[PDB]
Amino acid sequence: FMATIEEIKEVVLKPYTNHRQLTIREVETISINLIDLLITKDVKDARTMKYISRFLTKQDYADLVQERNLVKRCGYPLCSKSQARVRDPFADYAYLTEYCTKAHFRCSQFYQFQLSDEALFARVGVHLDDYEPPSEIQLLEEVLA
Ligand SMILES: [Zn+2]
Numbered sequence: 001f002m003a004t005i006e007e008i009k010e011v012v013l014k015p016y017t018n019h020r021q022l023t024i025r026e027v028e029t030i031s032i033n034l035i036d037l038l039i040t041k042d043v044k045d046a047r048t049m050k051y052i053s054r055f056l057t058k059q060d061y062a063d064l065v066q067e068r069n070l071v072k073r074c075g076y077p078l079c080s081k082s083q084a085r086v087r088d089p090f091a092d093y094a095y096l097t098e099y100c101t102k103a104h105f106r107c108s109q110f111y112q113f114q115l116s117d118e119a120l121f122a123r124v125g126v127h128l129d130d131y132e133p134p135s136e137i138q139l140l141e142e143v144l145a
Pocket of ligand 1: 074075076079080081082099100101104
């Protein structure tokens, strides 16, 4: 139904649990499999959303949002609605084309602003169960957005 930390470890990271170093191709394979998972499914909860951030640059997140919109999902990964204005190809304010609401626009920006532009490949040991992020990512409550 919805994606969790446990699932990501199993369907994305499982091959790499015993690697002490990753190649550039293996890092790319992780991002692709993670993005793929997050367009087929929505993120179940806050804890998973905070876990994700270690695998996303600000640009990978923007691309996540785009790919989610192409399958008619609200850009904000915790959401299971569509963007409010799904782009019709037979033709021919702006945030409503990417999000269900202004609130999800803001939650999405709030999350993105905190993501790092450090390349995934430069994030030493991010694939490991013992990795420690350089700060805890904050999620904006919808009511405050
Ligand atoms: Zn939404």
